[PDB]
Design a protein around this nucleic acid. Structure first.
Lengths: 132, 188, 51, 201, 100, 179
RNA sequence: GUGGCAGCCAAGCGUCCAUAGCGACGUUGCUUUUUGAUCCUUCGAUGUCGGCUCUUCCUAUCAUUGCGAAGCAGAAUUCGCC
RNA sequence: GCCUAACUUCUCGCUCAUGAGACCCCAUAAAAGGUGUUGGUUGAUAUUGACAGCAAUCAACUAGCCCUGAAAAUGGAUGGCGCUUAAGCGAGAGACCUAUACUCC
């Protein structure tokens, strides 16, 4: 039922709080609530975070209990965690939202025009398919 | 204190299958199939291998952890029911009045008569999947048999509690029908 | 009646423990009353045997 | 912050008091609220607690003339309505005008049978610890005197069957629309470029 | 202070208010439960209380002191001429009761 | 009364001594480690304990130095043992508790919060006898021991997530399970 | 305080056996259907005993319903619970 | 949390009560009990394999919450509604609301 677990080396994504929107690696578990994470290659300092602010990703690194910043960085670039994460819909949605939030008025106008044209054409094709 | 993880496992003998999912088990063997729902407990039940079912609890307190072995024993009882079933033998004891026990309604109701001589007739319906039989060889003996231990024992308890004495001391008015043996159908 | 049946009936009717606070019919090998009314009293007495 | 239309809220899997407080705030702030499936709202704690609380509520009647005393409504919709009323200054004109904007129903009336309902995640019962019993206002109403549990159940079953058929048709049409966009790709490639560049797909 | 000697209250409070009936005709507040197996039949009729008489009947009641003995009993006559069926109406269940 | 206000109580080293007199021209120098919100409270508690232990009070003594101590390496996790004495509503007791943290000050703050939670004991009724770092195999509390496993794994079973900056109502379905 | 009612430890009664049922020496509470203490309201007036009549309410349950325990073999009787 | 201006804000625990609890004076509760649960103290046995049945266990204590002790008369009061990883209990953090008080005009 549960596939992703809080384990040493698990790559977590900081959902809320200080370093929101970044990835880090679990290097220790202090208790059921607090976990020490260090994302040296994702611009996250070695710190302790509440699990309530973290989200488990699908990447697990081959780390050692309390692996130092050097080792966790070596493992991060070895596994290429950032490229693989960017490949996922998880990161694609985030990038899309980042682009969305920064749209200008002219860009909004262009998007509206293009979107309505595309919708009209797709509706024509949908009518064609429905007739068959 | 919330233990991080606590689990137990049940191993299934040959010829039986379970096929669990969503916290409902579907054990099946020679004597049919028993389905049991365990969604009142928030545990994780899964198949580990071919004939092993694991019931696990994450971050449970004493009361929740107490239920793991309960569920495992329930599944073991399902296995026993599908393999050898369940059979409860009950004996009638009386000082003077023969307790006349019979079946009616297509062998779906047990009738007790003459219990302490009362002219009232005691009627006990049988749960679905359970059957009853009087022993023609051993007098005063009634057997309730079925696959599901819960229903078999419920029928036995219903019959046993149907016969109770009133306004006289039970220390020496010992009349009644009592469950004398709990065993399996197939000789074990 | 036959002694085995006597014993069978007594096992359910007499061989039990009685709580001294709420008179609850309790199992013979019990340490505390199961009823909430007495607050799980730990002091019990055997059901009065035939003297 | 006012909504143009009434707010339709599916009452299923909602905590009674939390939903009532949210709805009372909305009513006071000026919106109209419709609550559907009031029999599916839940109250935390075992059934006996709620049953005994409602029995004690029933015991509150005027000694002189019970026709004057508290009016103990048994329907789930009226139970929710009274719970919201308790959270309003209903003895004043403000509270009365706010309360008159609420409609609570058992099941989904035909008027709202064809609209999308909302949920308040802050009032969902799934905030309770899993090992915590909870009762259902439908069961409470049935056990305290509600006479239309089975009728509402049958009507809801028919509604669910019709909705399932509609959803099967909608699934088919959605697959068809996906295929239609796939086919249209050659013509819309000019515009899809702009859509994706601005991040909309 | 408690009343010195107990006595039951006068009258049945479930039959109150003792007010004039809303209508002259008796309202049927409930009908017999419908069994689909039995043949179609009506469940009510209308008549007029004509008057009372008394009759002598032979009693068949085993174990009674008047078994196989004649007894005088007062009876009421209700004149019930045939009724004409003028219309048919039906009721549909709704969350607030049956509705015509 | 004394209260352990402020998240992550600070740690101070306080050194003081009785004011020299003619009969005692040279006085012993006393030093203590005190966890307090700020240095004023640090001095107050220093004088409290020193007056308890030796015949000297704030009037007749002086504070040679007050300094703050910062965790040497807040980049590592340790197990801390805390010996404390506290008073219940009925009697006085000695407790030994264990915590896991990257800072001794954090461990002491955890101790104060835990005592408040479990024994309804306030900061004024608690004395911290001693705080040390315990090795993994010298720990004797199951809650701390169960985390000394290199293969430790566990999911997050029932995650209730709070929406922050959106409307109360939504058509989205709420999912508490994330496999 | 007095009046009424309910608990805790058990020295003893109970043929033997402290607790079936009681329970001294002590001791903890509850209630305002007793009588006291006070003098807060009322002396430009609240009609002051008892009975009759009529409602409703509370139980610390006499009877009846459902039960548990006896120094419960049964008319009978006792204790206890909802 | 809504009445009600100000967060269903943030962190750690404890509590399930067949009407739990909920804030100085303040609007009652005790002796004595619980093998409910959570922490601690002390003394033992246990890998020369500790208790039950043909890998930790045992015993006595201790104090947090909860339960029993806990009976009154019109229908009724954490102020009400309600609230159960709380909107309860304890320790804390940010921000915010609000006087005829403080500053300025």
């Amino acid at each position: 039922v549960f596939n992703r677990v809080v384990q040493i080396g698990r790559v977590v994504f900081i959902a809320s709080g200080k370093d929101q929107g970044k990835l880090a690696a679990i290097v220790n578990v202090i208790d059921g609530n607090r976990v020490q994470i260090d994302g040296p290659s994702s611009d996250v300092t070695r710190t302790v975070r509440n699990l309530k602010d973290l989200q488990l990703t699908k990447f697990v690194l081959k780390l050692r209990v309390g692996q130092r910043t050097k080792g966790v960085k070596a493992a991060f670039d070895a596994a290429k965690v950032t490229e693989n994460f960017q490949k996922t819909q998880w990161a694609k949605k985030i990038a899309q939202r980042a682009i969305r939030a920064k749209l200008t008025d002219f860009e909004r106008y262009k998007l509206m025009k293009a979107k309505q044209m595309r919708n009209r054409i797709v509706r024509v094709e949908l009518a064609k398919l429905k007739k068959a | 204190m919330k233990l991080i993880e606590s689990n137990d496992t049940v191993v299934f003998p040959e010829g039986v299958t379970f096929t669990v999912k969503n916290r409902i088990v579907h054990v099946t063997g020679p004597r049919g199939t028993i389905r049991k729902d365990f969604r009142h407990l928030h545990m994780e039940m899964e198949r580990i291998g071919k004939s092993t079912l694991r019931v696990r609890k994450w971050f449970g307190v004493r009361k929740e952890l107490a239920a793991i072995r309960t569920v495992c024993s329930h599944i073991k009882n399902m296995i026993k029911g599908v393999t050898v079933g369940f059979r409860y033998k009950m004996r009638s004891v009386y000082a003077h009045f023969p307790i006349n026990v019979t079946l009616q309604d297509g062998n779906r109701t047990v009738e007790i008569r003459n219990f302490l001589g009362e002219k009232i007739v005691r009627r006990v319906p049988l749960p679905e999947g359970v059957i009853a039989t009087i022993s023609t060889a051993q007098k005063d003996e009634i057997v309730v048999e079925g696959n599901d231990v819960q229903f078999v024992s419920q029928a036995a308890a219903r019959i046993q509690q149907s016969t109770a004495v009133k306004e006289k001391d039970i220390r020496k008015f010992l009349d009644g029908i009592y469950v004398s043996e709990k065993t399996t159908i197939v000789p074990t | 009646i036959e002694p085995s049946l006597r014993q069978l009936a007594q096992k359910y009717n007499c061989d039990k423990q009685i709580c001294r606070k709420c008179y609850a019919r309790l199992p013979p090998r019990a340490s505390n009353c199961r009823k909430k009314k007495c607050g799980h009293s730990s002091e019990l007495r055997i059901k009065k045997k035939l003297k | 912050g006012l909504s143009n239309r009434a707010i339709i809220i599916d009452g299923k899997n909602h905590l009674l008091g939390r939903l009532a407080s949210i709805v009372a705030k909305k009513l006071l702030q000026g919106d109209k609220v419709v609550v559907l499936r009031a029999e599916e709202i839940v109250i935390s704690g075992n059934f006996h607690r709620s049953k005994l609380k409602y029995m004690s509520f029933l015991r509150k009647r005027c000694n002189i003339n019970p026709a004057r005393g508290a009016f103990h409504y048994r329907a789930p919709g009226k139970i929710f309505w009274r719970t919201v009323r308790g959270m309003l200054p209903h003895k004043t004109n403000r509270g009365n005008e706010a309360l008159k904007n609420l409609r609570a129903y058992e099941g989904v009336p035909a008027k709202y049978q064809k609209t999308k309902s909302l949920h308040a995640p802050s009032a969902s019962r799934f905030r309770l610890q899993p090992r915590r019993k909870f009762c259902v206002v439908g069961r409470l109403s049935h056990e305290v005197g509600w006479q239309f549990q089975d009728v509402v159940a049958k009507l809801e079953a028919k509604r669910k069957v019709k909705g399932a058929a509609y959803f099967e048709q909608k699934k088919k049409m959605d697959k068809l629309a996906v295929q239609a966009k796939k086919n249209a790709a050659p013509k819309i490639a000019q515009y899809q470029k702009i859509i994706e560049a601005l991040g909309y797909n | 202070s408690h009343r010195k000697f107990s006595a039951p209250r006068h009258g049945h409070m479930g039959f109150t208010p003792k007010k004039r009936s809303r209508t002259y005709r008796g309202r049927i507040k409930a009908f017999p439960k419908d069994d689909k197996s039995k043949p179609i039949h009506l469940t009510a009729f209308l008549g007029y209380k004509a008057g009372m008489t008394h009759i002598v009947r032979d009693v068949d009641k085993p174990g009674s002191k008047v078994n196989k003995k004649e007894v005088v009993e007062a009876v009421t006559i209700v004149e019930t001429p045939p009724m004409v069926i003028a219309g048919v109406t039906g009721y549909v269940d709704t969350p607030q009761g049956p509705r015509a | 009364p004394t209260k352990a206000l402020g998240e992550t109580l600070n740690e101070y080293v306080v050194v003081g001594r009785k004011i020299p007199t003619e009969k005692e021209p040279v006085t012993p120098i006393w030093k203590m480690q005190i966890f307090a919100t700020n240095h004023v409270i640090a001095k107050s508690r220093f004088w409290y304990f020193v007056s308890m232990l030796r015949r000297v009070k704030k009037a007749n003594g002086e504070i040679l130095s007050i300094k703050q101590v910062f965790e040497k390496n807040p980049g590592t996790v340790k197990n801390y043992g805390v010996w404390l004495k506290y008073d219940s509503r009925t009697g006085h007791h000695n407790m030994y508790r264990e915590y896991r943290d990257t800072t001794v000050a954090g461990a002491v703050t955890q101790c104060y919060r835990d005592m408040g939670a479990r024994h309804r004991a306030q900061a004024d009724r608690i004395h911290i006898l001693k705080v040390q770092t315990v090795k993994a195999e010298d720990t004797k509390r199951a809650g701390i021991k169960m985390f000394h496993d290199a293969k430790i794994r566990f999911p997050l079973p029932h995650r209730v997530t709070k929406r922050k900056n959106l409307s109360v109502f939504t058509t989205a379905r709420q999912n508490t399970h994330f496999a």
